Amino acid sequence: TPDTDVEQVGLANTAFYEAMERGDFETLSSLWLTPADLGVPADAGVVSCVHPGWPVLSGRGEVLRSYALIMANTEYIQFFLTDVHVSVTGDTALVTCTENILSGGGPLVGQLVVATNVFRRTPDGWKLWSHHASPVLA
Amino acid sequence: PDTDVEQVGLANTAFYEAMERGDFETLSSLWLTPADLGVPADAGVVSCVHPGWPVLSGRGEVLRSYALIMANTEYIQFFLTDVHVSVTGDTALVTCTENILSGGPPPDDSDELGPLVGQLVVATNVFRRTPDGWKLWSHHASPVLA
Ligand SMILES: [Cl-]
Ligand SMILES: [Cl-]
Ligand SMILES: [Mg+2]
Numbered sequence: 001t002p003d004t005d006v007e008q009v010g011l012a013n014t015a016f017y018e019a020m021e022r023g024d025f026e027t028l029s030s031l032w033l034t035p036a037d038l039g040v041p042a043d044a045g046v047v048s049c050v051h052p053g054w055p056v057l058s059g060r061g062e063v064l065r066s067y068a069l070i071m072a073n074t075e076y077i078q079f080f081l082t083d084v085h086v087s088v089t090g091d092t093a094l095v096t097c098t099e100n101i102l103s104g105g106g107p108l109v110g111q112l113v114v115a116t117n118v119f120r121r122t123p124d125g126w127k128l129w130s131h132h133a134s135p136v137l138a
Numbered sequence: 139p140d141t142d143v144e145q146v147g148l149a150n151t152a153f154y155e156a157m158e159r160g161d162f163e164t165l166s167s168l169w170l171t172p173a174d175l176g177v178p179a180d181a182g183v184v185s186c187v188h189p190g191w192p193v194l195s196g197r198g199e200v201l202r203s204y205a206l207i208m209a210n211t212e213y214i215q216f217f218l219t220d221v222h223v224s225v226t227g228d229t230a231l232v233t234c235t236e237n238i239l240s241g242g243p244p245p246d247d248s249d250e251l252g253p254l255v256g257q258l259v260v261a262t263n264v265f266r267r268t269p270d271g272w273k274l275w276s277h278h279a280s281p282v283l284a
Contacts, residue, residue, distance in 0.1 A: 002179040042139050042225040048233050048262065053283030056233045056260045058222060085195055087275075088179035089266065092229040094276055096185050096193045114193050116185065116278045118264060120226060129224075130231055132262040134280035137190030 006086045009093040009119055012126035013086075016117070017079040017099075023071045029064050033120050033127040045120070050132040052113050076104035091121040092129075099133060112136045143223045146230040146265055149272035150223075153263070154216040154236075160208045166201055170266055170273040182266070187278040189259050213241040213251055228267035229275075235260050236279060258282045 012031070019028040035045035049063040050056055051070075057063045080100040087094040099113040118130040149168065156165040172182040186194040186203065194200050217237040224231045236259040242252035264276040 006179050038226065042143050042223070044224065044226045046222075046224045046231075048222075048224075048231070050233075050260060050262065050278075050280060053281065054260075055235070055282050056220075056222075056262075058233065083193070085183075085185070085193075086180065087183045087185075089175065089181045089275070090228055092227070092264075094185065094264065096195065096276075098192070114187060114191075116187065116193075116262065116264075116276055118231065118262075118276075120229075129226070130233075130262055130264075132187075132278045132280070134187060134278065135190065135283075136192050137281075 002088070005088045005093070009086050009088055009095060009126050010084070012119055012128075013081075013084070013095045013097070013117060016128060016131075017081065020067075020071065021077055021079065023074070025068055025071055028067055028071075031128055032060060032063065033122070033129045034060065037122040037124060037127055038120070045129070047128065048130050050134070052111065052133050052135050073105055074103055075106050076102075076108070078102050093119040093121075093126060095119065098136075139225075142225045142230070146223050146225060146232060146272050147221065149265055149274075150218075150221070150232050150234070150263055153274060153277075154218065157204070157208070158215055160211075162201075162205060162208065165204055168274055169197060169200060170268070170275050171197065174268040174270060174273055175266070182275070184274065185276050185278075187280070189257065189279050189281050211240055212243050213239075213254075215239045230265040230267075230272060232263040232265065233261065234263075235282075 038045040082098045084097040095117045101111040115133040119126040175182040186200045219235040221234040238257040261279040265272040
């Protein structure tokens with residue numbers, strides 16, 4: 001269903017951020033697409049990630065490496081998501097949101113970030129194909 | 139497959155070219171409409187993030203922004219590098235580096251343009267298979283910051 005899809009895509013999005021918040025690398029890894037998830041040259045299922053102000057990370061290794069690092073370097077992170085919009089088309093879903101981030105590596109510093117997350121439908125649930133996050137600059 | 143990658147590449151190329159040459163009609167046509175999909179779950183609703191901007195949602199917000207950008211940009215060229223395409227079913231994901239060169243109006247009649255400025259930007263573009271070709275669903279661009 002449409003309503004169901006939107007809801008399940010939302011839950012997948014929440015999980016992704018919750019996994020960061022609790023420093024749960026195993027879950028986080030599980031939430032990202034693998035070509036096996038797809039049942040695998042046109043690089044079907046190949047993932048990427050842009051962290052705020054970063055160049056592009058490609059493939060599970062660079063991507064998961066960066067999250068393992070981030071988590072290993074952060075003592076405290078909370079995401080307060082707003083303006084969340086979901087678009088589901090076929091077996092792909094597009095989520096945009098504002099990431100209002102508070103972190104501590106330590107004094108709490110806030111970031112205003114916007115993200116586009118792309119999800120893919122798999123038997124094991126909606127999986128991340130791409131995360132692109134960027135600063136909102138004045 | 140081998141063809142999909144090439145067609146997507148072509149659509150991605152056409153998108154940047156339209157902007158370069160300030161072709162609103164082509165740019166408009168390159169962005170998805172829900173009619174392209176045959177239209178809830180906001181099937182085929184587009185979004186756009188320009189460097190440093192918040193999110194623009196829906197064709198109206200997105201196209202308005204392109205008219206404005208074009209109107210306020212005397213000269214722009216993109217030089218894409220490190221383009222990568224990933225096709226899965228009816229969706230394609232393209233990441234790239236936008237090496238952007240722009241310029242404003244000149245101080246006077248003795249010059250063609252104002253000084254030129256470069257930007258290092260990276261993008262994730264999400265395309266969608268339609269009977270009329272690959273159409274943009276999302277463009278998200280961001281500065282690469284030191
Ligand atoms: Cl699809
Ligand atoms: Cl820059
Ligand atoms: Mg060019």
